[PDB]
Amino acid sequence: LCPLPCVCQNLSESLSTLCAHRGLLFVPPNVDRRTVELRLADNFIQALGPPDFRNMTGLVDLTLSRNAITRIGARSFGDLESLRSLHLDGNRLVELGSSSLRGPVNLQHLILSGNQLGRIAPGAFDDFLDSLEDLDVSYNNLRQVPWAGIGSMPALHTLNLDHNLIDALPPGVFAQLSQLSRLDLTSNRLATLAPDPLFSVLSFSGNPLHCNCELLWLRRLARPDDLETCASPPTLAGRYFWAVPEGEFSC
Amino acid sequence: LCPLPCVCQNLSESLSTLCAHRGLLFVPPNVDRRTVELRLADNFIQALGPPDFRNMTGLVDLTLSRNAITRIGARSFGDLESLRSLHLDGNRLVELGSSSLRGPVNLQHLILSGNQLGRIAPGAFDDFLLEDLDVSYNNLRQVPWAGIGSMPALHTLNLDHNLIDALPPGVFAQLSQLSRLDLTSNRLATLAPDPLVLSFSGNPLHCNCELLWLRRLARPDDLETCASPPTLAGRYFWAVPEGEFSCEPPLIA
Ligand SMILES: *[C@@H]1O[C@H](CO)[C@@H](O)[C@H](O)[C@H]1NC(C)=O
């Protein structure tokens, strides 16, 4: 029912197995399959596979933050049909495959920040497309985000793409995102941007902005100074984006 | 001389140029060369080169924490002779070269944690052979032991949260002042008893006769776990009785 290092709190017909900061080397196999909240954060589990979370139908909240997971097997979360939140932050993941995130069909929160993700498959989020309300891919090495998947989530209200290496933002990626309230693009490799609407919150500070005529539409907006800086042309290098007059954006 | 976004505090002939959280894309070139404390943390500077810190003789404290440094040029800190502390944590450094950490001759503290360091040159630290060396939270499989073993003043070595699988027999031999050694969350399966505070939790310990010496020590339970043999897998290292650490001769040359 409860693994030796773990503590189980039985709420009104609801199981919560807490194994946080207990020095685990791998997910314990003696966890009850009736558990709803599985907390495995601050451990040292390096590998996830199919038998770790097999037959767990009613698992709602699974947190695996600040671990040492370098590899996630094909269909590790395959039986997690009720999974509404999945935390995989502060890990060593480099590539996310199509089979890795298969399973949580009603997933609403996906935290994948603080890893070393360089490539994510285009069909990785295909099983949790409609449901996904929050997508966090902060602090990774991402050059290209899977825009086809991220653009097919009608319920997404938060997308954290900050602290990555994204050099291009296409024009069809912002289309069809009605509930999008937050889009963080801080600390990336973006030099140019294309006129995008729905300006209610977009952050783009710490980007190598090319302050010329192509970036004059953005300079005309009523937005706060988030300390955005010009990296090129050399005359504008070092100067704040919101402090340089509109007449100095020449070609 | 003070750069437009930076604030300079002159406290009794002590220049403190603070540029933290200013959204800088690169180290400003209008910084006074007489500065002693240069704070450039929480900035978005991605590249360091030799003209960024040239002619700064009296620079003692240089902090570049939580930035986006992916590359450090050859002899970037070349003229920082007085540099006693260098913070380069929370960055994107993957490989440290021999010429990269050249310059600070009297360096006493070196923080290189939170990066993605996979390889470090053997002669990178050859200029300051240091009191504190931090290489935590990186992807290090092998650290420069020949360099780390040639620092007679080293009192702290943080190797935790890396991928170190082996610890050589004669490295800490020349380390007399070593008081702290963090080895938490690594790939270490076996340890050798070579003394003269050590943490080793979160390692894939092979709990047999080879680690029985460690089990006999009067140490607190830092939640160390056995990964092998299969009978001891999952159980705590400090909870398994000493009689259960059995083995067969290793038969090696
Ligand atoms: C200001 O700093 C300079 C050295 O850069 C020093 O000569 C001067 O005395 C300092 N001013 C005060 C009031 O301490």
Residue numbers in the entry:
A (entry chain A): 16 to 215, 228 to 278
B (entry chain D): 16 to 144, 147 to 213, 228 to 284
Please share text taken word for word from the publication where this structure appeared.
The SALM family of proteins also known as LRR and fibronectin III domain containing proteins (LRFNs), represent a family of LRR-containing synaptic adhesion molecules, with five known members (SALM1-SALM5). SALMs are considered to be postsynaptic adhesion proteins, mostly expressed in the neurons and regulate neurite outgrowth and branching. SALM3 interacts with all three known members of LAR-RPTPs (LAR, PTPσ and PTPδ) to induce presynaptic differentiation. In this study, we have solved the crystal structure of mouse SALM3 LRR domain and show that it forms a dimer that is close to identical to that of SALM5, and the residues that are involved in dimerization and their interactions are largely conserved, and our complementary biophysical studies support this.
The structure of mouse SALM3 LRR domain was solved at 2.8 Å resolution in space group P21. Four molecules, or two dimers, were present in the asymmetric unit of the crystal, one monomer had an N-glycan partly visible in electron density at Asn25 at the N-terminal end of the domain. The LRR domain further contains an N-terminal LRRNT capping subdomain (residues 17–48) and an α-helical C-terminal LRRCT capping domain (residues 228–278), which are conserved in the vertebrate extracellular LRR domain family. Both the LRRNT and LRRCT subdomains of SALM3 are stabilized by two disulphide bridges; in the LRRNT between Cys17-Cys27 and Cys21-Cys34, and in the LRRCT between Cys238–Cys257 and Cys240-Cys278. A flexible loop (residues 216–227) is present between the 7th LRR and the LRRCT, not visible in the SALM3 crystal structure. The SALM3 LRR domain, like SALM5 and SALM2 forms an antiparallel side-by-side dimer, with a rather small interface with buried surface area of 1,001 Å2. The interface consists of the “one-layer” central hydrogen bonding network described above, and hydrophobic interactions formed by the N- and C-terminal regions. The hydrophobic interactions and hydrogen bonding networks are conserved at the interface with Gln131 and Arg107 forming hydrogen bonds across the dimer interface to Asn156 of the other monomer and vice versa. Comparison of the SALM3, SALM5 as well as SALM2 dimers reveals highly similar structures with r.m.s.d. values of 0.691 and 0.758 Å for the LRR domains of SALM5 and SALM2 against SALM3 structure, respectively. Thus, these measurements verified that the LRR domain is sufficient alone for stable dimer formation.
